[PDB]
């Protein structure tokens, strides 16, 4: 219905047509994250060499 | 790239493998000598997972010959392929383990580990980016039941963040009389729960009944056996050995097919099931193949599949064939027996489609199933174990190597486990 | 002129940065040398394709891109392919063991390893730009470097540069192309990760792809190079308002304005037409109605589902070719009376439409036909939640049982990320029925 | 073979489906959550229609139609039949009616301000709201039920002068199925029932809601002369067009099914844009319960849609084999004239 904002150009044309109007974590956050995940590979890892020692 | 070491050990081990290596060295035109005389590049574009590249473009197994007995190993140098291998890789000692599990883990195979371990450094320096280990190796003997087993565990210990793959060759009555079997197969299944990533069962029963009822062969000999062990062995491994999208890799393949940590033992198979020396002139079409691959005369493990259901499982059809059909036909098999496959794991059947056939076929299909049906075959070694054990039968045998009667308490404890672990899946539902 | 930084992560973002950049190449006129003998500004120029080549003195033209891989061999094929004089070895990064298609190894054991290397090497093209935008992150849900890598250089990126907007093109999964079972947890674990340092992503359902490379291409079973070939068709389409002159999507904040009102709710269906076989020989020309019509059609969709049945928050027509606005009104006014198009009632129900003058440029030796008009249509609609239903149900189906679980645990991570996010998929999936529904 | 899931145990009419399937021996039903199926006979709330069609190599159809509980609530079939410009306000098959919530979008001012007209103007003023209704003449009695109600109903104008059936003077309503297939055909089932009262229509009181509510349940319950007229208070079309024929000297196909047919079409054509899975990854059928009242001169009104109607004991055997013909057989057909009128439309 309504044509709005044409905006012409070489490369082209755009417009809006209207039918109807309506009715973060910081470094030290990652890095804790990160190193509790390889501390508990670490943990598992040195149990399992514990196992195998006995 | 990502190397693989490949340990065989024992009589068997080092009979299997020797085969494994003679059929792969085919498959990439690599001759006796460990020359290239090839006519596709895809045949060395992953040579270097199996092979060591050398002085005068020479390719040499990285594999490693174990045993506490010089017998097979002296067949292996007289063999074909025998001067292909690394003559300082040829470890062994003089007295064996007469199929006593004890003196292969505790006593005479403690001598020789240390000797392997060496070796295996040595080819785990040289590695660009090591993968993990195979082993090939019987669990009914004494070498590699029983080594082998100490061989993974002192491995792991070196190598813990690596994947452990074997191809273990199950005991049956059917094929041999020494009655000891059942002890050392259970005491090796307690330590491949523990220590393996991957493990093919390879069930001499099912390999004996593939030659009798299905090949028609009323004498089988070891070598029949041994011709359905290499035709697996070559298709189990396809997808680590050419360029392909799907478990190119033994972690990736353990991550597709492993959803339980214990539960990692898999019911190989194969299609078309040949005799060796017997020419097949008739190429199978793709939905046989598919129809043969899935059926229990295949099977290279003595289970029913239609007695259990798919965890997991991963098709690989080699040839050349129209994907388009080897897609419909895969659907049409888990369509068609959707009841045989875990509702709980969505899309858990992979398939993979390699170009290059294997030596004598025009097209072929391996099969590598995760399912609940293999408990079967730890429930009939189980009965054998419990038959002996309940009169504390043999066990002089073992008690006379150091060890006491509770190690088989243990060993037969885990086992059922293991057994009543794949029942629980095999009973468990999407509610 | 301001710059936008491209970064391929895995396979599936390796293999698509290829096919766009390739593309980017014809459409430009640059060479695979890197020669642009249409650029008569030698060294540098603030032209509209500069947003993604930068200018060596020596006339090459150069892509704002990064391509990661925790594997040597996609990008290798990248450092001896046609367009190897491209790029600067310093843009092409590889590890040598890869995440194994689990999350956590991608985001934890191997990932940490080359992380600080990566932002290291995005932070030399953010030097050379005098005003960077913001990212474009090409990946997929189901790998494992794909999935776990890219949440974890998303969360990196917040934090180094605040102020930049971050775009995604990811590849949804679709078992006819998959290669792992656990495929649904490394896609709820990466949404899950991404989803607040995120600002708009647009989702490519691979059986969409597939099923347009099949029916409409009539390619027998399509290869990742026919998908690709396709798929950077549409993410040119995308793109071609930051490389070209224009008003409509010039700069990446423009997208979460014209695309995205709600945050979380920031992933745009796109729409794609004609898709035709170059091995047809007479194909008839379709007109603007045509094409414009089949925007509507679940068939032509990047993910499939049905728009009918949920509302819109912003849609959005891009056109290349003979177009002109008469035309569009036409087959808008024509469209609305015949189609079920239901807008939010705090959205105005309209469409922002573009058009670019040069009709969509195709790889010689392709699939696709030339063709003198194509669109793209870009809709916030809330029938894309059908996607995470989709795959939170094969999640719950695994997670019930905890299949597979164990390798995730095994590599650091805890049960209770796997219930955090699917807790957030559970959120996600009901912000989407709140907006969308009424019964 | 095909294969098959049941998910609504408690659909009489899919329960006899089922039971036909596999009596054919070329239908086999899966566990309801297995993913591999052909057919879906779903639940009847929370039909998960996001998930159908994604499956590789299987063609998959459902018996229920995304988007027809439109058609199918009490509160949609207002709101459609006044806001759809197809239906419009050329629309003189519907009776009168408001959608009214309670006071705690809403058109509660305008049914005040038309109902003042009727107080008025002298004519007929009796309503009725959406066992759980009401019927009085009294606006401030109908509000303040539904506000004590709690739920959203409907203020609909209660048809005063209805055909009276002799002897006995009593009121009735009548159920129509109709099957819409995957391809949109619209199929009548030639049998329809009448649900008719067992007790004369009083005029005056309306508080004995039995004359009044021609359901199934409340006669058998609540009926006094339950049964003395017809079987379980359902007379079938041979005796109603006979019925017809002695004393009004016309026929059930030109007095009344011209009507229904009319009304089934206009229903559903405006509907089809919205709910239609032509060009849909998975295909959609249906079975509907229209429910009409006939007045005193021969017109048909529409009192409502069911979308999991029940079938009428003596002709499940008939419909349910129907629908396995026309709405699944088509789609997977078997190996190796019609009880339905399909009503034409383009
Ligand atoms: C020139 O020879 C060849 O080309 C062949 C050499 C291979 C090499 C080799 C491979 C792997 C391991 C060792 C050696 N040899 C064999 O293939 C081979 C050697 S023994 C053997 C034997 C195996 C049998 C089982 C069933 C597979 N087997 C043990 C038996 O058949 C024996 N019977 C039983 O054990 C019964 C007795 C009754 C109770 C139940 N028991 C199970 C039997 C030998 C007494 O198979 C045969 C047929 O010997 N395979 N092939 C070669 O040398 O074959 C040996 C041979 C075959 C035929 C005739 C003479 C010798
Ligand atoms: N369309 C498309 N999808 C791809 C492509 N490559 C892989 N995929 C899809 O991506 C998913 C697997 O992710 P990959 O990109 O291969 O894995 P990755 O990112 O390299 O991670 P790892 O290999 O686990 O370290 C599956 O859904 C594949 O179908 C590609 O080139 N195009
Ligand atoms: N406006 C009206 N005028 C006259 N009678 C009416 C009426 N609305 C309802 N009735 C009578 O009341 C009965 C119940 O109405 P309605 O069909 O809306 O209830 P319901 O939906 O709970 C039962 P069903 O869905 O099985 O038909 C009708 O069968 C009809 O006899
Ligand atoms: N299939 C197969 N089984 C074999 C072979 N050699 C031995 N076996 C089986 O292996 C078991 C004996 O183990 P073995 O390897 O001989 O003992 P080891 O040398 O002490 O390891 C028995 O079950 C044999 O039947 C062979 O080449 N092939
Ligand atoms: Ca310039
Ligand atoms: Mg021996
Ligand atoms: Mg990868
Ligand atoms: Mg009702």
Redesign the pocket.
Known sequence: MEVIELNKCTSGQSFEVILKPPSDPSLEEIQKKLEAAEERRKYQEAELLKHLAE | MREIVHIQAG?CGN?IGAKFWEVISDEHGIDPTGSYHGDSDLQLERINVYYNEAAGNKYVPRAILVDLEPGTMDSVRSGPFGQIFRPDNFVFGQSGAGNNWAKGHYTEGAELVDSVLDVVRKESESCDCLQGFQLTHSLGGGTGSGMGTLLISKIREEYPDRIMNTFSVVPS?????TVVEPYNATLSVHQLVENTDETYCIDNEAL?DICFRTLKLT?????D??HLVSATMSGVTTCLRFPGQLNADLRKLAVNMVPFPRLHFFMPGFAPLTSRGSQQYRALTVPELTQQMFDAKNMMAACDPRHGRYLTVAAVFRGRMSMKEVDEQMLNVQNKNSSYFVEWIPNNVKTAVCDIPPRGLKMSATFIGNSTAIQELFKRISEQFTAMFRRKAFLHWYTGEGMDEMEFTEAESNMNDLVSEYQQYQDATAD | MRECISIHVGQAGVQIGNACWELYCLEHGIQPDGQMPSDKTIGGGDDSFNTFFSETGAGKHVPRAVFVDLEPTVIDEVRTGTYRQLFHPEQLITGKEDAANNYARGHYTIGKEIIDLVLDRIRKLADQCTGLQGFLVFHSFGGGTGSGFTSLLMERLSVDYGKKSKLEFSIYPAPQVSTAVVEPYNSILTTHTTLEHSDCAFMVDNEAIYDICRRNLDIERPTYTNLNRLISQIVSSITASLRFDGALNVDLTEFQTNLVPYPRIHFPLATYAPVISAEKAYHEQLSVAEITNACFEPANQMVKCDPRHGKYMACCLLYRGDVVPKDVNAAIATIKTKRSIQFVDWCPTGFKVGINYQPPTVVPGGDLAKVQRAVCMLSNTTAIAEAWARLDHKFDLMYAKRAFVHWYVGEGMEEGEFSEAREDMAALEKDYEEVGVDS | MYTFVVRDENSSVYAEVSRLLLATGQWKRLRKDNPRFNLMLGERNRLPFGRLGHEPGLVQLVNYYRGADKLCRKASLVKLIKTSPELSESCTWFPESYVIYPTNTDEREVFLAAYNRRREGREGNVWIAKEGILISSEASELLDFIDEQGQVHVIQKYLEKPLLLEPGHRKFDIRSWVLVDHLYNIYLYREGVLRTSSEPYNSANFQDKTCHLTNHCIQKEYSKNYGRYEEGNEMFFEEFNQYLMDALNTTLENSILLQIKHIIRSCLMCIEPAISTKHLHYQSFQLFGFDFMVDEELKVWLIEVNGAPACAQKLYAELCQGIVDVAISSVFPLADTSIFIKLHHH
Not at chain 2, 219 to 223: I, V
Request: no cysteine.
């Open positions: 009589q009979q009555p059917k094929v041999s009389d004996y004498t089988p000999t070891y070598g056996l041994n």
